[PDB]
């Protein structure tokens, strides 16, 4: 019933648990699995700042992209090791606002399911939905499996 399953991943343990359920559903349906990691742009952060960040807090401009890439590749590799055929899994890295970017990606690529962690890099003992999960679950055009 699901032909193209999207798993947004952020390098968190919550996202890995989401990926694992995505893999289970992939095996049940034979769907394509699309993995996406969104990274924040330098501009989007400092655009909404009153004063500039000190140059002591500087990072390479492509360092966030490289990190997102490693995360997406970890996820792809894990998915294939867990039994998803390599030709069914595709990994992507996109710059931008996570919730916005995830929902746009899901619509553009005609994904019929998004599988997302309940919590992410800011996870805790709380049973509150992470901000990205909350926004994606609300705004996605397709069903959203919160894991």
Ligand X SMILES: Nc1ncnc2c1ncn2[C@@H]1O[C@H](COP(=O)(O)OP(=O)(O)OP(=O)(O)O)[C@@H](O)[C@H]1O
The answer to whether residue 144 forms part of the interface with its own copies (CB under 8 A) is: yes
Whole-angstrom Cα distance, residue 18 to residue 118? 8
Q: Nearest distance from residue 129's CB to its own copies, in Å?
A: 3
From candidates 103, 120, 140, 147, binder to Mg ion by CB under 5 A: 120
Query: Per-residue x/- marks for Mg ion, 45-74, CB under 5 A?
Result: ------------------------------
Map the footprint of its own copies across residues 104-133, applying CB under 8 A: 118, 127-129, 133
Please tell me what DSSP assigns to residue 128. P
Whole-angstrom Cα distance, residue 50 to residue 145? 38
Task: Please tell me whether residue 126 adopts helix, strand or coil conformation.
Answer: coil
Query: Per-residue x/- marks for ligand X, 21-50, CB under 6 A?
Result: ---------------xxx------------
Task: Please tell me whether residue 51 adopts helix, strand or coil conformation.
Answer: coil
Label the pairing between strands 113-116 and 144-146.
parallel
List, as residue ranges, the binding site for ATP: 8-10, 38, 117-122, 131-133
């Amino acid at each position: 019933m699901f032909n193209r399953i999207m798993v947004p991943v952020d390098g968190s343990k919550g996202a890995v648990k989401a990926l694992e359920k995505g893999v289970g559903l992939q095996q049940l349906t034979g769907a394509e699995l699309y993995i996406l990691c969104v990274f924040k742009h330098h501009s989007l952060l400092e655009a909404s700042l009153s004063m500039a960040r000190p140059e002591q807090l500087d990072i390479p401009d492509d360092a966030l992209k490289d990190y997102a890439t490693e995360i997406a590749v970890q996820a792809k590799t894990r998915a294939t090791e867990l039994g998803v055929p390599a030709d069914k899994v595709r990994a992507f890295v996109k710059g931008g606002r996570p919730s916005r970017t995830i929902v746009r990606f899901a619509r553009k690529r005609e994904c019929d399911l998004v599988v997302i962690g309940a919590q992410g890099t800011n996870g805790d003992k709380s049973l509150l939905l992470g901000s990205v999960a909350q926004r994606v679950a609300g705004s996605a055009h397709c069903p959203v499996l919160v894991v």
